[model samples]
Target: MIPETLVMKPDFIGPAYYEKLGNAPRFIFGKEGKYQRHILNSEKHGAFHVITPASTTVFPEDALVEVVNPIFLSDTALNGNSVAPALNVFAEKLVLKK
Candidate 1:
């Protein structure tokens, strides 16, 4: 079925911080803050590190771009149990059928 055009905001909070996978980048796609400003002193700026295996990939500010929609996965849960642990891992989810 075709997806519906969104008219209302989805019931969600996001960092869009994805779990690290071998194929994907480490960057989150959503804007982290609303404030905007200009910078000139740093000289080279706004080419955010997408951090995928394509570590050099970037989009410059004032440049328009297209991206595949980042949709609802399942909710994410993260925790660290006990006082100390040797191996640590993050949690993520997806809805699946049996």
Candidate 2:
């Protein structure tokens, strides 16, 4: 019941390289100087950690990148209604029928 870490600093120049990857609690969104669209409330419980930034160069040198376990599809049937059949929401328990 704890997973909320969304750091999308397009190129805000890394924050001490992501705080040395320490900190157990989650919920950390990013975006400064234009771009107002934040949505990472962990839906109905907790589950989401999206960090972007990668690089690689061979020859006795290498920058690593990792984001294992990533598969998304959480649209909670947009019931709030804003003139749409679906918006975006995910809390699990989704089946399209067989």
Give the winner by TM-score. 1
How many clashing residue pairs, candidate 2?
A: 3
**lDDT winner:** 1
Minimum summed lDDT over a 10-residue window in model 2 is located at: 10-19
lDDT of each residue in 7-85, candidate 1, tens digit only: 5322221112222224332334552322211111111111211122233243343333322222423223443422122
For model 1, the stretches where C-alpha displacement exceeds 4 angstroms are 1-54, 73-98
Candidate lDDT (C-alpha), each: 0.25, 0.24
**lDDT value, residue 5 of candidate 2:** 30
Q: Tens-digit lDDT track for model 2 on 4-63?
A: 334642112121111122123233244222211111212222223333222231112122
Question: Which whole-number lDDT from 0 to 100 does residue 28 have in model 2?
Answer: 24
Clashing pairs in 2: 4-27, 74-89, 75-89
Segments in model 2 whose C-alpha atoms lie over 4 Å from true places: 1-20, 26-64, 70-73, 79-98
- C-alpha RMSD by candidate, in order: 16.7, 16.9
Error of 2 at 54 (Å): 20
TM-score against native, each model: 0.21, 0.16
